[PDB]
Amino acid sequence: MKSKLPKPVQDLIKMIFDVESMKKAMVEYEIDLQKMPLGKLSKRQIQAAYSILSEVQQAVSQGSSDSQILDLSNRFYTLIPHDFGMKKPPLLNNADSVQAKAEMLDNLLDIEVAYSLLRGGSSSKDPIDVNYEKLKTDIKVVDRDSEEAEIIRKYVKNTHATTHNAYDLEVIDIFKIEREGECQRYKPFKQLHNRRLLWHGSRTTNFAGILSQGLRIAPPEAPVTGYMFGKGIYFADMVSKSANYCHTSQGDPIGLILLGEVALGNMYELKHASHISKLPKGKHSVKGLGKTTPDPSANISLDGVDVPLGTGISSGVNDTSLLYNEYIVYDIAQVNLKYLLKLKFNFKTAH
Ligand SMILES: Oc1nc(-c2ccc(C(F)(F)F)cc2)nc2c1CSCC2
The missing domain is CATH 3.90.228.10 (Phosphoenolpyruvate Carboxykinase; domain 3)
Structure with missing residues (x-):
């Protein structure tokens, strides 16, 4: 049934729920979409990655060995697989590197929430009306x-x-x-x-x-x-x-x-x-x-x-x-x- 929502409201629903924009963000973050597609993202995955970043921050500040820091960095990249092409994954050995990954996980969390919302739930009414109601x-x-x-x-x-x-x-x-x-x-x-x-x-x-x-x-x-x-x-x-x-x-x-x-x-x-x-x-x-x-x-x-x-x-x-x-x-x-x-x-x- 054709939506009765004003076009600027309809166009806002289309914007914020765009799957191509979601994937574009993951690719910008250099995440491997083959190993980690949009639908594979979980709250428990991002929470576990956050925990590894806190472990990294503690390791760095508590004087851990380079092998311990690299092992921790490898755990992060195992959990959230990235694709660097010819490049090697940046070592998470300094505070700047972890602030970058924390910022990313912040943004990934809302992408999980958007997509889970969009894919979840129930017909005979406009999918724009359905998605406005979900908000x-x-x-x-x-x-x-x-x-x-x-x-x-x-x-x-x-x-x-x-x-x-x-x-x-x-x-x-x-x-x-x-x-x-x-x-x-x-x-x-x-x-x-x-x-x-x-x-x-x-x-x-x-x-x-x-x-x-x-x-x-x-x-x-x-x-x-x-x-x-x-x-x-x-x-x-x-x-x-x-x-x-x-x-x-x-x-x-x-x-x-x-x-x-x-x-x-x-x-x-x-x-x-x-x-x-x-x-x-x-x-x-x-x-x-x-x-x-x-x-x-x-x-x-x-x-x-x-x-x-x-x-x-x-x-x-x-x-x-x-x-x-x-x-x-x-x-x-x-x-x-x-x-x-x-x-x-x-x-x-x-x-
Ligand atoms: O207006 C602002 N927004 C955000 C902001 C943007 C994105 C995120 C998220 F990490 F993506 F969830 C979190 C916070 N941060 C600041 C300001 C203005 S004050 C400086 C910090």
């Missing part, structure tokens, strides 16, 4: 000329800096999203002070799982050292910072970005990386202090939530490894997803 998310189109659309376009326009200006962002569609059960889950944290409407950028191959299971934290098996501020949910107050996580190109210039209401409370303000396991007593989030911050005078309050749509101005900071701020929560319930944007990247050089 357990109400996806509404926000009108181009609405007040909220004007606020979101101002947020994108003003929070787009010159350092990242190797592209221009063009907002194609704005979706008002609400995941089944997320409001009730967030209610205890709706109480907390310092709630902000922040950005979360991710690969398009990650949004089926993001809409289905929400924004998650890396599992306990994952190395805490494989993430800058530990295993939490990362956000940005400047669209350009998050837009760099959209993994777009000349070939595919369309990305997906999120606007989430994040209950931050007391922020553990830091200038340099910290591998947070447990947050300090009295703190509810981390604020990675950046050199540039949106103008605090220009802050707006859409639905009681602070929208830091201020134009990029310099902050006090001074001794920091961050150009732009970042916010991190360590409870998946501290996030309430509000909007999903479909962005066009108009790539061009600028000096």
Whole structure:
């Protein structure tokens, strides 16, 4: 039965559930699709690989022998078979190598979730309607000329800096999203002070799982050292910072970005990386202090939530490894997803 969903909603389902995009990502990661096809991927496979990366991180830091490190590296590549052609598999003997593999396993996890979702379940109704229902998310189109659309376009326009200006962002569609059960889950944290409407950028191959299971934290098996501020949910107050996580190109210039209401409370303000396991007593989030911050005078309050749509101005900071701020929560319930944007990247050089 022909779908009654708006074309921009239909086209979003087609995007996030594309199997060719999924396989394209695995190939980019240099995974052997003969030994490890899409359907062979398991949660237990990725969790076991995470455990080996933590074993590697421990081995390196506890002064293990090169043979022990190589054996561990070989175990990883046995579990997630890669195809390097003439090249040899990169030795997982340093922290950078494990951060690369942790990032990959993060992205593979959502690909497993998308494909398992897509292949699972049940006829006589459009497969787009079937797949919209699987997301357990109400996806509404926000009108181009609405007040909220004007606020979101101002947020994108003003929070787009010159350092990242190797592209221009063009907002194609704005979706008002609400995941089944997320409001009730967030209610205890709706109480907390310092709630902000922040950005979360991710690969398009990650949004089926993001809409289905929400924004998650890396599992306990994952190395805490494989993430800058530990295993939490990362956000940005400047669209350009998050837009760099959209993994777009000349070939595919369309990305997906999120606007989430994040209950931050007391922020553990830091200038340099910290591998947070447990947050300090009295703190509810981390604020990675950046050199540039949106103008605090220009802050707006859409639905009681602070929208830091201020134009990029310099902050006090001074001794920091961050150009732009970042916010991190360590409870998946501290996030309430509000909007999903479909962005066009108009790539061009600028000096
Ligand atoms: O907006 C952002 N998104 C992500 C982000 C992208 C992909 C993934 C995943 F590993 F693929 F699940 C996780 C987090 N990270 C950051 C920011 C803005 S603050 C800097 C870090």
